[PDB]
Swiss-Prot record:
Biological role: Appears to play a role in cell sterol metabolism. It may function to protect cells from over-accumulation of cholesterol.
Segment forming the signal sequence: none
Protein name per UniProt: Vigilin
Organism, as annotated: Homo sapiens
Entry-annotated residues carrying Phosphotyrosine: 6
């Protein structure tokens, strides 16, 4: 049942809405640039955690990239 790598980045401030602008585009910028599966969960349970899953270095790279540079 699936065999990909995943990982979430801890977030707080309104990074989601800011990352997905009004509708959402940045999500594609990475997912397409790093060939990964980045997703912005529209929730706020104490601590936010953006979903990031792929396979190659693109997932671990784009993961550390967003958490660090965050575009």
């Amino acid at each position: 049942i699936n065999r990909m790598d995943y990982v979430e980045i801890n977030i707080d401030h309104k990074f989601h809405r800011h990352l997905i602008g009004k509708s959402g585009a940045n999500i594609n910028r990475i997912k397409d640039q790093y060939k990964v599966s980045v997703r912005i969960p529209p929730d706020s349970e104490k601590s936010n955690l953006i979903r990031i899953e792929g396979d190659p270095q693109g997932v671990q790279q784009a993961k550390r990239e967003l958490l660090e540079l965050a575009s």
